[PDB]
Design a protein around this ligand. Structure first.
Ligand SMILES: [Cu+]
Length: 97
């Protein structure tokens, strides 16, 4: 019910938090940059229904703030990852029940 994806932990660790997120069909998933940037929103891939390889955005924004929000509907588990933080181990997931 209205969640947000924070990029980076207070431990100056560039990782997606919460690593995992769950929502309902029709909920929204926001995304804000905690720290250790820059960041971005590049999904990994989603099952039939949505378009993971579309909602993505490699428009890494250095400016720290709340990137943006997006609503979903297609049920299933969505994955993603950071562009600059791909090796740092900054990956997360989302669920739309
Ligand atoms: Cu990142």
């Amino acid at each position: 019910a209205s969640v947000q994806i924070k990029m980076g932990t207070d431990k100056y660790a560039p990782l997606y938090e919460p690593k995992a997120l769950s929502i309902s069909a029709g909920d929204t998933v926001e995304f804000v940059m905690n720290k250790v940037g820059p960041h971005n929103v590049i999904f990994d891939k989603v099952p039939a229904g949505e378009s993971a390889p579309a909602l993505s955005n490699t428009k890494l924004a250095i400016a720290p703030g709340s990137f943006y929000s997006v609503t979903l509907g297609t049920p299933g588990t969505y994955s993603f990852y950071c562009t600059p933080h791909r090796g740092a181990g900054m990956v997360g997931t989302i669920t739309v029940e």
